[PDB]
Design a protein around this ligand. Sequence first.
Ligand SMILES: C[S@@+](CC[C@H](N)C(=O)[O-])C[C@H]1O[C@@H](n2cnc3c(N)ncnc32)[C@H](O)[C@@H]1O
Length: 188
Amino acid sequence: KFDPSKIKKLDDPSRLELFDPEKVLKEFGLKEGMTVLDVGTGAGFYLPYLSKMVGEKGKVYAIDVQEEMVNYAWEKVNKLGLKNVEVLKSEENKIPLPDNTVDFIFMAFTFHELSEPLKFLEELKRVAKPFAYLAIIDWKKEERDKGPPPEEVYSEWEVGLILEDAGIRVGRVVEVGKYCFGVYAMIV
Ligand SMILES: C[S@@+](CC[C@H](N)C(=O)[O-])C[C@H]1O[C@@H](n2cnc3c(N)ncnc32)[C@H](O)[C@@H]1O
């Protein structure tokens, strides 16, 4: 799990150097009116983005298993005036949402942190509508002059395999700005 006392590392405007937030989202299919789930919301860094992209009509559920991250992200939305965002306290494999409520699922740098992936994936489909798109973004499994140790992350290869076990269908796997990759998946 990410360390709560290092949270400022998640609220660093220099993260933009990894990839353009709305360029990537728009390309992965996030649209106005869509209800999006932000799994490891952390500091709520990408929240201003997701918020903007769904607009007045959409909604953003920002979850996180850690209470400190939840309250930090919350103060963030209020500080910035993000009215369509709902920050919630999550449990490892349980999302506090009713079935078929999400259109877009965004998982930024949080997949490799899941205790029990395929079990979390099942919980994910539940809250996910029959349609639903899954956008998973993470670090490459090599060595980089900017990201965490490789044994600490999955490689695009492993991830998309797990998704397969879980039943999710992967359609695209593209590099994301020199340090990360991204995966396009649709929930069945
Ligand atoms: C790399 S950090 C996220 C940083 C954030 N995505 C950003 O872009 O600034 C990963 C977050 O995942 C959360 N996390 C770990 N397991 C989780 C789970 N099963 N459900 C929800 N959040 C989880 C942690 O509390 C941690 O803050």
